[PDB]
Amino acid sequence: AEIGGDHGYNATNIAAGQTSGAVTQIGPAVMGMVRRAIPNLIAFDICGVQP
């Protein structure tokens, strides 16, 4: 009666592949890295430049 088992649903147990069942999987694939936006400038029409 081989049980497939699940991860604990814990965040650590998954990242390790640790599984209550028989098999311990490799790892949690990758769905890709999310970065944070780079914010916008007000430009300079508000103030004279004069390099």
Binding site: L41, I42, I46, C47
Partner: protein, 51 residues
């Protein structure tokens, strides 16, 4: 001041440069500050309105 032990493995695992990530966020941070500066002096140097 990033680290030499980092760029080796971070390039191995994530493929990112770990340099152009810092040079990207410093050169961007000096601009986002020099832009938030000349907005701050507008708000700083402005008379109180509705007065």
């Amino acid at each position: 001041a990033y680290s030499i032990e980092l760029t080796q493995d971070l390039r191995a695992v994530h493929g990112m440069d770990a340099d152009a990530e810092l040079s990207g966020i410093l050169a961007t941070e000096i601009m986002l500050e020099i832009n938030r500066e000349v907005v701050d002096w507008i708000n700083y140097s402005a008379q109180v309105g509705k007065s």
